[PDB]
């Protein structure tokens, strides 16, 4: 044992006299810098988790308060800090700009501007490190949140104020479930109603810069960057900027929660924050654990993913929904970080690369996916048809082995091989085409009721596209009688019988 601040220059002045020349209550010199971790002699009044501000213009964050020095992580390059550089205080935990002057802008994890339009014009701030609401200021979730995907809205539904984990292997369609979740909201976000709007945030952690640049151009052309904030700690940065970047984006989306509005945040992905924390711990010499993660790494993703809440009428009526993204490695959902975040959240959506090549895109596994809330977070019409649909696509999975070499089976088993392969063909869907909700209640009503059994399975994905363009134009008055009433009455249940059968005749030509 020697102690860190027992070097030959610290002791040397104390033999001379009292330390009046430097005060050490407010400014402290640096002992030793290396790999983005500094050691500072002095700074007696520094609070834990307080920003400091180095001599070369960079910033910091105080994490280790030790009896002779303080260890502070550095934002930015380390070729600007040296040994003997005065450090000062700001006097607060880190804060970020917040308002509605962020909408349509692209910000990094400290609230600055990168898209080159101009400086942000907000007049408010917020600390990144605040707490969740308690047991009392919430209420059970009841609001639909629509994605536009026939699988996600009918088999594993999301509500407002819920966590839902997008988990799956590489190259599977993860970033694209959460990019027409955004584009689908333009239906509601230009109209006149206020309790159906939504304001989306996208957080990019550790991606390369020119995948973000291919995303501000995907969303501008589809006209959804007038209500979308983009927070981007990319890969070339320092490691603590990628550590703050989901807290920096979960405080930007809490102002929309405290004020009776709604929001939705997409962490992409949470398996690169947890590696950015681990680099910072094991250079601060905090003791490791399993897979060299520190002990408090369940404490990273538990205090973050519990700030998504559904508040109540006496607090404003806000919301916040979170979709975190996690990448496994060859179907191994039993590693360390993929087993923390499955325990925290409220369900997962599981995408496989075997189904991606067998012709099923979006490549969703239905058997290994769940939402814990489920049928309460659906509209009263999507609840009506999917209760017959989720059951019948579940009976197909038990007899799914017989289909390879089978014709000498029972007529009941030859039926489940028939009906189950039509419903699989309905759920296919092209990229960047979200659907309105009452239109999906048209398509799914055709398959599950019996109006597709007399057709050929390569003619299912043609019939759906020809059934929709006939019902948008020549029946627009009946796709607003579900979007208003909500529930399919019998006066509409008898009218769609006279549309599908009076179209199934004049189709096959």
């Amino acid at each position: 044992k020697t102690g860190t601040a027992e070097v030959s220059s610290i002791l040397e002045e104390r033999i001379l006299g009292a330390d009046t020349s430097v005060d050490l209550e407010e400014t402290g010199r640096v002992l030793s810098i290396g790999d983005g971790i500094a050691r500072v002699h002095g700074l007696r009044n520094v609070q834990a988790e307080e920003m400091v501000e180095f001599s070369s213009g960079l910033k910091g964050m105080s994490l280790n308060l030790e009896p002779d020095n303080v260890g502070v992580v550095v934002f930015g390059n380390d070729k600007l800090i040296k040994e003997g550089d005065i450090v000062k205080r700001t006097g607060a935990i880190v804060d970020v700009p917040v308002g509605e002057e962020l909408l349509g802008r692209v910000v990094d994890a400290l609230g600055n501007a990168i898209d080159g339009k101009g400086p942000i014009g907000s007049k408010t701030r917020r600390r990144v490190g605040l707490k969740a609401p308690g047991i009392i200021p919430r209420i059970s979730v009841r609001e639909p949140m629509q994605t536009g995907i026939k699988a996600v809205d009918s088999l594993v539904p999301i509500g407002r104020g819920q966590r839902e984990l997008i988990i799956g292997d590489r190259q599977t369609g993860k970033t694209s479930i959460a990019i027409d979740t955004i584009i689908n909201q333009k239906r509601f976000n230009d109209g006149t109603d206020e309790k159906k709007k939504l304001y989306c945030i996208y957080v990019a952690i550790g991606q390369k810069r020119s995948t973000v640049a291919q995303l501000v151009k995907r969303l501008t052309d589809a006209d959804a960057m007038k209500y979308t904030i983009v927070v981007s700690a990319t890969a070339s940065d320092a490691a603590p900027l990628q550590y703050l970047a989901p807290y920096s984006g979960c405080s930007m989306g809490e102002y929309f929660r405290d004020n009776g509005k709604h929001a939705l945040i997409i962490y992409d992905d949470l398996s690169k924050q947890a590696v950015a924390y681990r680099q910072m711990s094991l250079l601060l010499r905090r003791p490791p654990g399993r897979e060299a993660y520190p002990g408090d790494v369940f404490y990273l993703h538990s205090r973050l993913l519990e700030r998504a809440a559904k508040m109540n009428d006496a607090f404003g009526g806000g919301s916040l929904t979170a979709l975190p993204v996690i990448e496994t490695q060859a179907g191994d959902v039993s590693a360390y970080i993929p087993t923390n975040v499955i325990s925290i959240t409220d369900g997962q959506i599981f995408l496989e690369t075997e189904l991606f090549y067998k012709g099923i895109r979006p490549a969703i596994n239905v058997g290994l996916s769940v939402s814990r809330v489920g049928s309460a977070a659906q509209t009263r019409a999507m609840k009506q048809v999917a209760g017959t649909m989720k059951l019948e696509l579940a009976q197909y999975r038990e007899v799914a082995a017989f289909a390879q070499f089978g014709s000498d089976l029972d007529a009941a088993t030859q039926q489940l091989l028939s009906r189950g392969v039509r419903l699989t063909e309905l759920l296919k869907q092209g990229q960047y085409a979200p659907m309105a909700i009452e239109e999906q209640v048209a398509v799914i009503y055709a398959g599950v009721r019996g109006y597709l059994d007399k057709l050929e399975p390569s003619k299912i994905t043609k019939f759906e596209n020809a059934f929709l363009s006939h019902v948008i134009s020549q029946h627009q008055a009946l796709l607003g009688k579900i979007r208003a009433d909500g529930k399919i009455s019998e006066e509409t249940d008898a009218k769609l019988k006279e549309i599908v059968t009076n179209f199934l005749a004049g189709f096959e030509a």
């Binding site: 390059n77 990168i114 950015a276």
Partner: protein
Amino acid sequence: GAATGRIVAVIGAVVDVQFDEGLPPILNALEVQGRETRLVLEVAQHLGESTVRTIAMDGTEGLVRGQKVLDSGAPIKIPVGPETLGRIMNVIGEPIDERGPIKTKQFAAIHAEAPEFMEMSVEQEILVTGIKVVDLLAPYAKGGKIGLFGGAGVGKTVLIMELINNVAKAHGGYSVFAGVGERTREGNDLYHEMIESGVINLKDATSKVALVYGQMNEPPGARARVALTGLTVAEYFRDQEGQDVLLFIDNIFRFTQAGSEVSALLGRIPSAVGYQPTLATDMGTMQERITTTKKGSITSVQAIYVPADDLTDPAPATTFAHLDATTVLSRAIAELGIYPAVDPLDSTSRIMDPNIVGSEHYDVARGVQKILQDYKSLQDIIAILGMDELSEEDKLTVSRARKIQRFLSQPFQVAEVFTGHLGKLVPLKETIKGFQQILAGEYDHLPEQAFYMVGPIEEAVAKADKLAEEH
């Protein structure tokens, strides 16, 4: 000279120096005196009482404690410019080919920062190389980033020296080959494979390539900085001149893996399976300087060793995000004689899109991959039921799928010393047309041995007539 330090502790390839007057910053260069060769040490940490912790770039034999150390005032300064073409260069920018010195008027320090968000060209294109698995199933892009995966002995130095033949001779812009730790034998072929092929000219000034070679007989601190001497010559051609460049690097796993060889000697606690705790940070510091900005373009092809065929290893699985196009070579395919070994169901590009490549290219390559995943569900039935139990529809699947699998193989021009065949170079319009017909049924009447190692589909019927005449 400034801060003439002194050496105190040479433990491995990690030398610590102690400065009397002036401490240098992180990432500098230091010059050890009194040696007949040039040994360069780069600063990495500041320890207290004016001692730094460096890393040598050469051999640490003969280092007596108390030895003076000068300082230059900057990171390592290489030569750069137009006169670096048709040359081979060291990590610290020196000649290693015994032709004399590099006479340039511009130096570039190898530590720069990634260009910002507002300097990002967004456009996609297509690029045709001539191969029926690249151009059909995982197509390239003019300015994209391309990674060649796969284990040891599957075909990565051949597939990367065939694309040097195909693209980097019919190209107007320039190319750079950076050799980051590979066999010094293989770094003598490509120096001589391209003197006779006109890409290097040893008497006049019309060469179109530059070489950077630090191989696997080098200490593991110098096998971490030839990845950065590469994309400093390959950035002066993009930024300063407004040109177009090609970037060839083999192998880029030796940049990561030579950072795990000095992690614990520096003083860090090692992470998971043995790598340094700064894996995805020192990597992404480098793989963001290889981008196409709005001043030029870079088309980068990098070979990526997968250790022990384990793709879920942390050194390859953190490289799958810095790339637009992945071509993954397997070994269970190259054991069947199929060459190029490229896996059809594991390669993937971004521009496989019905709005860039067209809605005829897209419907083909999503039926080749759909009939090959239909094959594997039948191979588990054949292992029990045998081949002559299947129905007559499923027999038609296996025959076309084996016709498609044999047609994906193609004789490269650099296999004219290995197999004795003759080389092909198939255009794109014939590639789409040939595969469109095997799925239709218009070659159901041929033997499979016609399709093995041909070019266009019209050569695969000129073989089924020679087999029937010599019967």
